[PDB]
């Protein structure tokens, strides 16, 4: 324009015309104060609503579990020293589950003791507790091969709350300052796993043991997310009726139960309940979901994986052809692509190696908007709720009766399923290695995975994590030595994103188990296409100002012609293309972005579709 324009601190009316196309309240001191008071009334009423569940003998019991980390201890010493401070000897037998009422704190406690021989039974016991009491020895320090693995495993499945306890520190008395030196060491060790806690009690002192007892009675535990969104109960008694109709009585602790649900027992699988009653009766009204799943030579094997993984780490996906081998018949299935992130590979491809189940598989899409929606309905439909004394009748196959034990001697526990979780789908897991598991893991090798209560034998497929616009990703032969990774298989879905633990059975080990890794249920996503990449390679050997010719990549003129269209690249990063076959031995000549030399190598990439394998329960 060329003119110094007009200025004003606020817009002129001329400017506004071109651009074109209840009372406020003062808070008086009284009403300020009044609002704060009536807000506090809500908070206080809300705190009562939480606590009523534990309020007394009429309320629910709190579930305590004792876990000694050293066999030196004997768990009966732990419990006995606690019971003394209750100051009622009427409290203080051929059994490992105990119900106690404490007059001193008007509190109901259930104590469960696991059988320390059965490592897997420890996890199952601790999985249901509100409080886990860790026993430590002042005399002998925990062993890395067993004692620590208890702590590490419990953390990764999740713990409602934890207490550190000592019971025998006087066994190293000279002066109690020497006891304090040891106690400081144990606290520093314990805090490494549980940095929220800074105290370990000495039960040899009356003041500490009373302090522990008070806490168990008075304080509330944390919730466990994946558990409390389901229902669960612990059996007070079990009974059998005629193929069976197994009866359990106990207390509701989760979100709740409905007689039309499905019920999982961790050792035995899914079963249907037929009736419920409250200690009114509820019956399975047949407008219900149903039980349908659809609609020394080993040294050579270990050495093989050790050698193969070392090779794959140096020269990944490189392949050797051989003379008298047809490249077509070997490789015709491979499509060949410029870039996985840009290819239009179809998900539910019709190729014959695709599993027989496809329409048979459940597919969800928006897992997030599915998960939260399902829960909202489930909590509304609950019939029995926390603290209800209940009986339940369950369709129980009579031949499994040989596996039942008296619940007074062994933990028997019951979990409700979410509706579609019985159906199989494509599922995805995060995975990273256990604390020092340096062994090679082959992508096809079978593994046992626990996630939530249930556990399955799985053969995975490994891939790296990224957000490709098409969900196509490279299949990988072995688990990366360091990064987190994504593993894919077919299994029954979980909506709660339970933590997952990865291990392999090994009865040669003291705990019968070898621990491999941990992770999380990410999602069901069938679009998570895996492509098996292959690299062929050949040697450029003669060089001209406009073309280079390459040996050994192919051995027949017919093969050079059939694969002519796939682009070439150098590992030094130049691209190129086949011109034509030269001669009968399968030489070719090619053009590239620039100068090559015999110190470079010429490669080409090809890709094949992969599909997940199915999986089966484990016990």
């Amino acid at each position: 324009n060329g003119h110094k324009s007009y200025k004003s601190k606020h817009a002129s009316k001329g400017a506004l015309k071109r651009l074109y196309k209840k009372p406020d309240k003062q808070v008086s001191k009284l009403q300020r104060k009044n609002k704060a008071k009536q807000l506090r009334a809500q908070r206080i009423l809300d705190s009562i609503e939480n606590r009523k569940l534990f309020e007394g003998k009429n309320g629910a019991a709190k579930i305590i579990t004792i876990v000694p980390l050293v066999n030196d201890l004997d768990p009966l010493d732990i419990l006995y020293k606690l019971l003394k401070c209750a100051d009622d000897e009427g409290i203080m037998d051929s059994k490992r589950i105990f119900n106690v009422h404490i007059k001193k704190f008007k509190s109901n406690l259930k104590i469960i003791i696991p059988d320390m021989t059965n490592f897997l039974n420890i996890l199952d016991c601790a999985k249901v507790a509100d409080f886990v009491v860790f026993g430590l020895s002042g005399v002998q320090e925990v062993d890395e091969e067993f004692g620590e693995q208890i702590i590490r495993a419990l953390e990764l499945q999740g713990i409602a709350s934890y207490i550190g306890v000592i019971s025998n520190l006087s066994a190293v008395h000279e002066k109690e300052k020497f006891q304090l030196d040891v106690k400081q060491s144990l606290e520093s060790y314990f805090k490494h796993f549980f940095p929220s806690e800074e105290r370990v009690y000495n039960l040899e002192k009356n003041s500490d043991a009373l302090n522990v007892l008070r806490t168990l009675c008075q304080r509330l535990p944390r919730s466990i997310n994946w558990r409390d969104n389901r229902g669960y109960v612990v059996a007070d008694f079990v009974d059998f009726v005629e193929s069976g109709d197994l009866v359990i009585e106990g207390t509701v602790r989760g979100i709740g139960f409905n007689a039309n649900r499905l019920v999982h027992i961790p050792d035995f699988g899914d079963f249907q309940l037929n009736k419920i009653e409250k200690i009114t009766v509820f019956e399975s009204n047949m407008n219900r979901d149903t039980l349908d799943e659809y609609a020394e030579e080993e040294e050579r094997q270990l050495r093989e994986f050790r050698d193969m993984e070392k090779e794959d780490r140096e020269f990944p996906d490189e392949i050797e052809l051989e003379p008298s081998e047809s490249a077509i018949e070997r490789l015709k299935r491979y499509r060949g692509l410029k870039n996985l992130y840009n290819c239009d590979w179809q998900v539910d491809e019709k190729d014959p190696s695709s599993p027989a189940e496809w329409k048979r598989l459940l597919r969800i899409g928006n897992y997030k908007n599915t998960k939260n929606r399902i829960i909202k309905e489930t909590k509304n439909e609950a019939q029995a709720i926390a603290g209800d004394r209940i009986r339940m009748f369950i369709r129980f196959p009579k031949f499994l009766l040989e596996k039942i034990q008296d619940p007074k001697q062994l933990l028997f526990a019951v979990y409700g399923l979410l509706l579609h979780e019985h159906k199989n789908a494509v599922v995805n897991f995060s995975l990273q290695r256990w604390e020092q598991y340096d062994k090679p893991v082959p992508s096809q090798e079978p593994i046992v995975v626990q996630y939530g209560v249930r556990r399955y034998t799985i053969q995975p497929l490994f891939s790296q994590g990224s957000n490709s616009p098409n969900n196509v990703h490279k299949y990988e032969r072995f688990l990366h030595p360091d990064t987190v990774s994504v593993a894919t298989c077919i299994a029954p879905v979980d909506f709660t994103q339970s933590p997952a633990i990865f291990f392999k059975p090994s009865p040669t080990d003291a705990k019968n188990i070898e621990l491999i890794g941990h992770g999380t249920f990410l999602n069901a996503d069938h679009s998570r296409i895996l492509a098996k990449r292959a690299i062929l390679t050949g040697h450029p050997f003669r060089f001209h100002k406009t073309v280079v010719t390459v040996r050994y990549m192919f051995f027949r003129p017919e093969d050079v012609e059939w694969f002519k269209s796939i682009p070439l690249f150098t590992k030094s990063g130049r691209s190129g293309f086949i011109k034509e076959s030269l001669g009968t031995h399968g030489y070719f000549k090619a053009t590239f972005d620039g100068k090559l030399s015999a110190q470079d190598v010429v490669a080409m990439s090809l890709y094949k579709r992969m599909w997940p394998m199915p999986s089966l329960p484990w016990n």
Partner: protein, 48 residues
């Protein structure tokens, strides 16, 4: 999700920091353990 976290100001007295549009706070602790200790492998997070 449903973790508990402790938050602190992102250093600019109520303004957002640098490149990041409208982000004013940074995480300091999760579940009662500090992120710096986790990053350097000094402590371990118990799940929930």
């Amino acid at each position: 999700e449903n973790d508990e976290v402790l938050l602190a100001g992102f250093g600019r007295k109520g303004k957002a920091k640098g490149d990041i549009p409208g982000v004013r706070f940074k995480v300091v602790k999760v579940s009662g353990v500090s992120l710096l200790a986790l990053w350097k492998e000094k402590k371990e997070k118990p799940r929930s």
